[PDB]
Amino acid sequence: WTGIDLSDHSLPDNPELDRLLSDLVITRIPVGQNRSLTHERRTAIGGFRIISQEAAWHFRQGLGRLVRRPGVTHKNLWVLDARIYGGAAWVAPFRQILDRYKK
Amino acid sequence: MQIEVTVRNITPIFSAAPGSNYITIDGTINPPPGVSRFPLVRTRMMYVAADVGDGVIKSVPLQIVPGNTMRSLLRRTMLKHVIEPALVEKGNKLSIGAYATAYSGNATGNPDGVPSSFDEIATMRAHPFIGLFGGGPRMLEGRLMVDSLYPIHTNAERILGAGYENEMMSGPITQVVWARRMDPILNLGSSEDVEVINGGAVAANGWIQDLLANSKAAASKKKGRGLKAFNAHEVVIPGLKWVWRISLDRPTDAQVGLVLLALNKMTNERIAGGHSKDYGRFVIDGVSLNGEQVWSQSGITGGEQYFDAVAEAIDGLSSKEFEQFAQSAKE
Amino acid sequence: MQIEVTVRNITPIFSAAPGSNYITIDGTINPPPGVSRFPLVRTRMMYVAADVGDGVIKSVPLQIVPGNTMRSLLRRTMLKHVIEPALVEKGNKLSIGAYATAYSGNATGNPDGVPSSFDEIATMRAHPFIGLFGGGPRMLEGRLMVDSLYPIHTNAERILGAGYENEMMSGPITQVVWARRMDPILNLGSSEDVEVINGGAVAANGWIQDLLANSKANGRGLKAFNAHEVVIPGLKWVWRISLDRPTDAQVGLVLLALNKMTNERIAGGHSKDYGRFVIDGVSLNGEQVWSQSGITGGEQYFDAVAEAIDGLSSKEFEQFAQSA
Amino acid sequence: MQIEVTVRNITPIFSAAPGSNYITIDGTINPPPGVSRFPLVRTRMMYVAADVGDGVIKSVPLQIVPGNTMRSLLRRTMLKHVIEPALVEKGNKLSIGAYATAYSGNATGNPDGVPSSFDEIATMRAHPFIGLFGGGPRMLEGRLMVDSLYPIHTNAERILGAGYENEMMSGPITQVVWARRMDPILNLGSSEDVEVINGGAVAANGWIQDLLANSKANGRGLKAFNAHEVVIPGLKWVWRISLDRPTDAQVGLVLLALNKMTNERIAGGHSKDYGRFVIDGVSLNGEQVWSQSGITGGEQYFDAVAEAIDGLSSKEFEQFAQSA
Amino acid sequence: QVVWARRMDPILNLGSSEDVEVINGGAVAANGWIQDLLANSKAAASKKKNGRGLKAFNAHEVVIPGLKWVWRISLDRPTDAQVGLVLLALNKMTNERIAGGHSKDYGRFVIDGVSLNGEQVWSQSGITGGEQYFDAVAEAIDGLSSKEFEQFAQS
Amino acid sequence: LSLPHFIDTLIVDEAHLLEQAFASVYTHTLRLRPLMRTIEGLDALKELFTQMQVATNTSLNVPLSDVPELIPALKDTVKTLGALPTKGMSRDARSVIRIATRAANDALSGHSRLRIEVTPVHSYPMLLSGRSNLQRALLGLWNATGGATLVSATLFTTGDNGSLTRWKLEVPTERAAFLPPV
DNA sequence: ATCAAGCCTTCCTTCAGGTGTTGCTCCAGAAAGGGTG
DNA sequence: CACCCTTTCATTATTATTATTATTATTTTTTTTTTT
């Protein structure tokens, strides 16, 4: 999810032919992915706002694996969690990052 | 000066909410009718836009003390501890209309819409106390601007921007406290207990017969008011952290010094109400002056220019400004 | 004027809370329905901000006796132990309205919404007892402010400012106490026990058969089994009593009742001796003035109340209780 | 008026704490399931704040006999050996309601809504039996405050602030006592034993088959195994009997009930002889009056209860019990 | 939400001899105020079946706090100094209030965002960006003179 | 010694991990199986494991509310591990002894939490004394910093809202500044 | 090293109809005159 | 002179109201790092 370089270093000068990661798929919204003591205390203070916040952070870090440099082309993003396409309100932040892409 | 003060109430807060609220014996607020209900006097509530969940922004009730209330409290502390002491150690004295103007803003109702002189408005807004509380019959704009008391709470997250995410509560924040009000002569047990009552046993038994006759009257009405009144009132729980934002649009240093000297007298003062039940006692645990933390446990230990300014303005305090403030143009 | 009266209850404290709480055979409180449900009368609890995880402050329960009740206990001790002996000692007799206005806040549950005259207000707020306890038909404000009794518990560490950190206790402070009332006519036993009953054994037998009738099916029999949650005994409590610009007689009256306050029950559970307490200390504006024999020091307050109870008369109480 | 009855228990003390508790073969009260738990009814326990280590007070266990239990006990000995002999010697006849209210504080389960008139309160309060234990339909307050039986134990050092500093027990004070049921028809052995059963040996044999059919397979048969936690004998307890402006007759009644206190049992488990005890000392307001031959001292109380026993009619018990 | 406010008489809220020595006339003046209020109350009670006192219980409905408000500022072909002036006002607007209610301290607010032609330009510490607006208004306010105000006024 | 006592300017790249770094250095873990193999080359620590068995959340975020026999076993572990002879102890074994005694002495204070974990390889027993309140340490870091730059790709929740991350690393709000992102 | 491995009914009852004060106030007009610096 | 201040006129005559309605309760299980 977080902290992996999926760009080709065998293609330094030409990002247009970079093809290490053509398809990124998110099977599930990354809820509850951090269980450290400080974050569990912070969850106990703030409530679900901390969990939804950190879930959005992990979601954007998982979405950052696609583009690592300008000049790449035809990068595929998929999300398969059904809460993305339902009418539920608590998954509302994961819309607006999703709203920064089109078609 | 944008003063922010955090006060920890060490007893409950009861600023009563006007209305006709009820509660059942279990503790459900405002029950459907037909069940046995007892009158509940709720604490002061404001609806606040708050973050429940994420972006589901909603009006939740947050229990506060009104800004008008704590404003009156700020006025009374300075008036009781700074103004009137420094007004009676000298020979100055206040008329009853000018005391009413210094305390209630106005000497009476029915204000004169005739305005006031520009030299007058400038001299009252340069005053230490009158520029803060610009009441009078000709209605001044006072430069003291007092916030409602907010609990540092998850429902007040939009009110309090940052720096208060720690020491911040959540969830339900109140408690219903019940009161009995037991008729005293029902507790009477012997001839030794009854000797202070005029007539002793005859008057006690006569009031007993009155109470039973009123009981038959109540049973007739269901199917003159006694001294048994068992009710409820909702308080804000004690130990909560609250924030209070005093605002001063271009103050004289003496005026914010008056606020700071009042804050010094803020301890051993009562916030909201419930004076019989000791509700509203508190301890200040922080004072910030333009965001700069200026409260130690001994006192302020800061704001020194405002302190010497209000010092010089309270030996310069006299009753002439108060009297010409309270003087009505029609009267 | 701030008083910190630390008491220690000797027997368990039971200030009952209104509401229909229920208890199972075990410790469970207010269970899901269908189980064996027995009625529980819980102690009065209050919620406090407390650090449940050293940074996270949450409204935890903590069992108290309310300051409304505490004010009455302090009021009653002064009323029965100082005020009435001074009244009959000089022969002063109150009316029943002034008597109720001494014990409750007024005589009639209807107050007239009429201002009392200033000189009246100055005499009563300079009166020791009536200055402590306001009210009346014109609804005077007192000078006495009684806070609810609070133990030096780790749930009230935000309530307790300083000087009580070591004294604070930790953990649960409650115990459910079970009570039964059987039928003693079921526990009768012998024909020499029924002779005190009129009619004798057959009449006693008559009661038994109604019980068997009441077994097979609003009248209620004697046999009841229930529970009441109490605070545990031997815990250390603190009490705040505040005094708004008080005259010397008023603080002296407060010290008189508290010193003789040991012979008194914190209200709730009289028959089970629940209210018994001993006062560990009395801090008098931060200064400890309690001893084993009572309040040492504070000599001008005891003097001023001594010259106040000489000169207590009925007419102040009568004019207080007289409705406009 | 304060009374402190210091006793020593001859037999062990079992006052059953409610709660279906469980026990293994060696300790482990309320184990996890599947270890073959046995039913256990523990003795009544009061949680009490105690000085556990230096500077730390914790809510610890201490096994007691309830103050409600021994309130009813003191009332029972009072009524069986003083009050009922008085009403037989003058021939006074109590009603069913008068009897039930004198033993249980109420005639029915419904208290009346009206309060009693003050003459009735004064007459009943003056009366010793009525004053000591109130109640009835109009819910009379009583002058007696009966506190629970604490042992003189470390868990009650905070309770015994004055006196009882010596004679302190450090270790636990409970022992688990195991009682089994046995089936006699399994244990009879011989047919000369069954010649007294009608039906002969075949009836006893057929009952053996009923229990065999239960052993293969919810009518409970016989032969159970039980444990009950008991308070160990020989340990000193303290009783506290407080009084609320008592007449001399009420204190004399208490001392009249107290002198014979030994015949009775401060417990449950009647058949196991649990509750036998000897009073080590009795102090009225701290003064020692107890001897081997009952109470030595308090002669004005005994004279007042002597003159109050005379002229004690049934009509007091009748009028108080009668509901409006 | 309805916020209730009560003014009450503070000559009802007195009550010590130390509370009254500050009064011109003192005890008798306060008692004369009391009897005036009593007579006014009896006159009002007989009127129901014009000088009022100080007791006043009233209500005012307020918008709840924490709500996000939008604010559209449209400049019809402005100069650059005009946009700089609006931006400096939006910078320094944090110490001023909305809709009055000064004593209750109503209208306290914080700016969440400022979109200049749709692109967000507001920072927590003012407006970051639009430096040409800030430079134009800086030269303008160096060039600011009251003679332009007088020629706009009189002639 | 390792770094200056006062840092005049501190720039932290990949900022969002920095808080986790503090959560790793203030957590002291006792690993039971490498110690148990090292001593073979005490019975009280076997009883400590048997007592750790009795306490899917297994002793999460609980400082001292469960003490079945945890503190006598901890004190016995401390004394049986600290009194073994250093002479003859291997130069790589004393490191295992010291890290285990440091974990046990971090659990000794009661100022830190406790949490048990298992390895991915097998169900081996893991004892951890971590801390969930890092305000004093991070405040001591930001006191020794004159000015700092918060740098990462992932710092802001919505817009420039860095109040969550300011509440991660306990940055003083008087000193915090949440610059507009790119 | 094992069995017997808790049984039955208790499972609430009154009192608590809250009452008083608050029940709004100002101003939103420009002439034309007379006494000023 | 410009400005700044004090006092005249009218007589109107009922007076509906927005009847909208007002205080909560949802997840979930990683396995890092490169410090003493």
Tab-separated table of C-alpha atoms in Angstrom, chain B residues 53-167:
chain	number	residue	atom	x	y	z
B	53	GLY	CA	-18.821	10.941	10.958
B	54	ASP	CA	-17.117	12.661	8.026
B	55	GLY	CA	-18.775	15.504	6.121
B	56	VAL	CA	-22.275	14.603	7.361
B	57	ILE	CA	-22.332	18.063	9.016
B	58	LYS	CA	-25.167	18.367	11.504
B	59	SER	CA	-26.797	20.499	14.205
B	60	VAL	CA	-26.054	18.782	17.508
B	61	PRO	CA	-26.877	20.248	20.939
B	62	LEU	CA	-23.865	21.536	22.837
B	63	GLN	CA	-24.446	22.655	26.388
B	64	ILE	CA	-23.125	26.137	27.089
B	65	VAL	CA	-23.399	29.179	29.277
B	66	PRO	CA	-24.795	32.169	27.320
B	67	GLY	CA	-22.503	34.956	26.213
B	68	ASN	CA	-24.940	37.416	27.761
B	69	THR	CA	-24.661	35.463	31.005
B	70	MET	CA	-20.831	35.289	31.274
B	71	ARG	CA	-20.727	38.872	29.995
B	72	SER	CA	-22.880	39.915	32.981
B	73	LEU	CA	-20.561	37.746	35.156
B	74	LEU	CA	-17.484	39.571	33.723
B	75	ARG	CA	-19.140	42.934	34.489
B	76	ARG	CA	-20.089	41.946	38.024
B	77	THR	CA	-16.622	40.611	38.954
B	78	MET	CA	-14.877	43.867	37.828
B	79	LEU	CA	-17.685	46.012	39.362
B	80	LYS	CA	-17.565	44.060	42.645
B	81	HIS	CA	-13.812	43.683	42.950
B	82	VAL	CA	-12.224	46.600	41.088
B	83	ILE	CA	-14.676	49.411	40.325
B	84	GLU	CA	-16.794	49.867	43.476
B	85	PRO	CA	-13.868	49.154	45.914
B	86	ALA	CA	-11.903	51.881	44.146
B	87	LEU	CA	-15.079	53.984	44.131
B	88	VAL	CA	-15.712	53.804	47.889
B	89	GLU	CA	-12.191	54.083	49.222
B	90	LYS	CA	-12.572	57.663	47.973
B	91	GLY	CA	-15.613	59.798	48.656
B	92	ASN	CA	-17.284	59.169	45.295
B	93	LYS	CA	-20.809	57.804	45.279
B	94	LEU	CA	-23.315	56.664	42.703
B	95	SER	CA	-26.971	57.484	42.211
B	96	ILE	CA	-29.430	54.600	42.021
B	97	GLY	CA	-29.947	55.230	38.316
B	98	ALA	CA	-26.195	55.273	37.831
B	99	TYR	CA	-25.782	52.019	39.770
B	100	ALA	CA	-28.531	50.586	37.552
B	101	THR	CA	-26.629	51.873	34.512
B	102	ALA	CA	-23.326	50.439	35.752
B	103	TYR	CA	-24.920	47.026	36.424
B	104	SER	CA	-27.852	46.572	34.050
B	105	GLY	CA	-26.537	48.767	31.240
B	106	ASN	CA	-29.465	51.151	31.609
B	107	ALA	CA	-31.002	53.096	34.480
B	108	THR	CA	-34.495	52.059	33.312
B	109	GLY	CA	-36.315	50.887	30.246
B	110	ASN	CA	-37.821	53.211	27.593
B	111	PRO	CA	-34.522	54.532	26.170
B	112	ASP	CA	-34.165	57.959	24.605
B	113	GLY	CA	-33.358	57.714	20.916
B	114	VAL	CA	-31.726	61.141	21.146
B	115	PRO	CA	-28.076	60.274	20.599
B	116	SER	CA	-25.096	61.425	22.476
B	117	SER	CA	-22.261	63.831	21.848
B	118	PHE	CA	-19.117	62.833	19.945
B	119	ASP	CA	-16.897	64.111	22.731
B	120	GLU	CA	-19.162	62.113	25.017
B	121	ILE	CA	-18.950	58.865	22.966
B	122	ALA	CA	-15.170	59.240	22.761
B	123	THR	CA	-14.820	59.895	26.500
B	124	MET	CA	-17.016	56.937	27.465
B	125	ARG	CA	-15.194	54.597	25.108
B	126	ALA	CA	-11.917	55.822	26.578
B	127	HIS	CA	-13.292	54.998	30.045
B	128	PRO	CA	-12.001	51.771	31.665
B	129	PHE	CA	-15.440	50.335	32.439
B	130	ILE	CA	-17.962	52.305	30.375
B	131	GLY	CA	-16.175	51.654	27.077
B	132	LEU	CA	-16.368	47.971	27.892
B	133	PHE	CA	-20.038	48.024	28.857
B	134	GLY	CA	-21.527	50.729	26.727
B	135	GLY	CA	-25.051	50.788	28.065
B	136	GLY	CA	-26.635	54.041	29.188
B	137	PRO	CA	-29.953	55.453	28.038
B	138	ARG	CA	-28.364	56.726	24.801
B	139	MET	CA	-27.121	53.338	23.695
B	140	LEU	CA	-23.362	53.174	23.376
B	141	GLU	CA	-21.478	50.425	21.587
B	142	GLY	CA	-19.350	48.871	24.291
B	143	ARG	CA	-16.001	47.560	23.149
B	144	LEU	CA	-16.127	44.421	25.309
B	145	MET	CA	-17.417	41.449	23.363
B	146	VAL	CA	-17.944	38.259	25.323
B	147	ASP	CA	-18.330	34.707	23.989
B	148	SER	CA	-20.533	31.935	25.221
B	149	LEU	CA	-18.750	29.382	27.395
B	150	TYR	CA	-17.996	26.398	25.190
B	151	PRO	CA	-17.005	22.983	26.537
B	152	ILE	CA	-13.897	21.727	24.792
B	153	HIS	CA	-15.895	19.017	23.085
B	154	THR	CA	-16.008	17.099	19.816
B	155	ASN	CA	-19.223	18.937	18.929
B	156	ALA	CA	-17.350	22.256	19.255
B	157	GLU	CA	-14.565	21.257	16.850
B	158	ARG	CA	-15.664	23.764	14.214
B	159	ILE	CA	-15.878	26.525	16.832
B	160	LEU	CA	-12.365	25.875	18.167
B	161	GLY	CA	-9.951	25.717	15.255
B	162	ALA	CA	-6.773	24.027	16.476
B	163	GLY	CA	-4.810	23.568	19.677
B	164	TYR	CA	-7.770	22.012	21.492
B	165	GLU	CA	-7.871	18.546	19.895
B	166	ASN	CA	-6.270	17.161	23.024
B	167	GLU	CA	-8.060	17.689	26.393
